[PDB]
Amino acid sequence: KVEEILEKALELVIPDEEEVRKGREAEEELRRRLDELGVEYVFVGSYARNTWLKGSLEIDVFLLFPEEFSKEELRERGLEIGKAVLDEHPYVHGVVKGVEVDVVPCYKLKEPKNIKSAVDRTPFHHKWLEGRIKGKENEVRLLKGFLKANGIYGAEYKVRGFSGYLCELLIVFYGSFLETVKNARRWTRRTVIDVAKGEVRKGEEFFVVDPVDEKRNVAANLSLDNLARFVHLCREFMEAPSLGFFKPKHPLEIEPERLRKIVEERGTAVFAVKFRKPDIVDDNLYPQLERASRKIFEFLERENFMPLRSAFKASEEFCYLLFECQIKEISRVFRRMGPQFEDERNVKKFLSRNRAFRPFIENGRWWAFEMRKFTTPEEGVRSYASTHWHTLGKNVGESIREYFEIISGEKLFKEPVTAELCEMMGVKD
Ligand SMILES: [Ca+2]
Numbered sequence: 547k548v549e550e551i552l553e554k555a556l557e558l559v560i561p562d563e564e565e566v567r568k569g570r571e572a573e574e575e576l577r578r579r580l581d582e583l584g585v586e587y588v589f590v591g592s593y594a595r596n597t598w599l600k601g602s603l604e605i606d607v608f609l610l611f612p613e614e615f616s617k618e619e620l621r622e623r624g625l626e627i628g629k630a631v632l633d634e635h636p637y638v639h640g641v642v643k644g645v646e647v648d649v650v651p652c653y654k655l656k657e658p659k660n661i662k663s664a665v666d667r668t669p670f671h672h673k674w675l676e677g678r679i680k681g682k683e684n685e686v687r688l689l690k691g692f693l694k695a696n697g698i699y700g701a702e703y704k705v706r707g708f709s710g711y712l713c714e715l716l717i718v719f720y721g722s723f724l725e726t727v728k729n730a731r732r733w734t735r736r737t738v739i740d741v742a743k744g745e746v747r748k749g750e751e752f753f754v755v756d757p758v759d760e761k762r763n764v765a766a767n768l769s770l771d772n773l774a775r776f777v778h779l780c781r782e783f784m785e786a787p788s789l790g791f792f793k794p795k796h797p798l799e800i801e802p803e804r805l806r807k808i809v810e811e812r813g814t815a816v817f818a819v820k821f822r823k824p825d826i827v828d829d830n831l832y833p834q835l836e837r838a839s840r841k842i843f844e845f846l847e848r849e850n851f852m853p854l855r856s857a858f859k860a861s862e863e864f865c866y867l868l869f870e871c872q873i874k875e876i877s878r879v880f881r882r883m884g885p886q887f888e889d890e891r892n893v894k895k896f897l898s899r900n901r902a903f904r905p906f907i908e909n910g911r912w913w914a915f916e917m918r919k920f921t922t923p924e925e926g927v928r929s930y931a932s933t934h935w936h937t938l939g940k941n942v943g944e945s946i947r948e949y950f951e952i953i954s955g956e957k958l959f960k961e962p963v964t965a966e967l968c969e970m971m972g973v974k975d
Pocket residue numbers: 704705
């Protein structure tokens with residue numbers, strides 16, 4: 547059955563003529579414009595190697611240069627060859643014949659001499675792959691489609707999954723999609739896949755050695771949990787192959803009343819911190835949302851609200867930090883630790899404070915009943931976000947400093963976070 551399933555999967559991952567047409571049209575046209583300017587360039591994307599996933603057409607053209615500052619010479623070229631345009635790091639993005647195109651500067655290099663490397667490597671990545679991926683393009687597509695349908699294709703921080711480069715290296719290492727999944731069933735968090743040496747060994751962390759640069763982990767951005775999810779999916783697929791593994795899962799359709807019912811049944815405190823989304827790119831925002839979520843989670847743990855799990859969502863205008871806690875309310879009174887009975891001066895100090903109830907000795911130490919300044923996790927977070935917003939990421943914290951609100955109940959359910967809430971609580975269809 548497996549072999550038959552992969553055949554049907556091909557219809558979902560391979561681009562259809564009409565988009566493959568747009569690519570061709572745009573490529574010829576882009577070459578014409580580049581040639582006329584006598585520009586030295588090379589197509590290095592997934593498009594150039596016909597390994598791009600259906601519906602994901604885009605062109606990556608790198609411009610080869612020797613000098614130091616040409617950040618502007620590229621500004622020109624890109625701006626001149628692109629029908630429409632927008633924006634060391636800086637590059638030109640636009641469209642040509644209706645196709646997305648990235649125009650990046652870099653040094654035409656006499657091989658491995660990557661200057662303040664990053665963009666200078668890409669051409670080598672393409673060179674190494676070009677002659678080794680031929681004939682296995684669709685294998686790469688099945689891999690990408692499999693990953694995408696399961697939300698783990700993409701190395702951007704929003705996804706923390708598998709980069710396209712990583713997918714091609716895997717296909718080259720194992721030979722095909724099927725073989726990649728069969729072997730991935732045995733990957734561990736210490737697995738080192740050294741492509742250039744054709745070997746697998748144990749290491750400190752999951753590491754896929756870049757054949758172009760040994761010290762670089764091509765899977766640097768693949769999170770531990772998405773590696774885990776992939777290994778599991780691979781095991782599940784081989785156990786019972788289904789075309790469904792290549793199909794995106796469908797958004798759980800649930801009314802607010804049913805969400806309220808689930809929450810009331812779990813008996814937890816479910817709430818969110820809502821604030822304006824700061825004007826920064828995803829690769830900057832997402833790590834800040836993860837940090838903010840973690841700090842508040844840690845605050846909730848420390849304050850004994852027993853948080854279960856957290857999650858976040860970035861909409862067009864707002865961001866949401868979601869939490870579920872096992873404690874909806876904690877007592878006003880708490881135990882404040884005092885000094886050992888021996889320390890006379892500190893004991894007098896500890897006892898000099900006015901309190902509603904008398905302190906006491908326990909296990910040779912003084913203790914006092916004191917009052918919390920909040921009794922619900924929502925009140926705890928209102929306090930934390932009001933004075934400790936600086937710990938929530940530079941831009942996320944600054945937005946929260948200006949404005950935030952804690953929402954729960956039907957109000958919360960109305961926000962565009964239902965999918966994140968369901969996922970967080972493990973709600974099923
Ligand atoms: Ca995500």
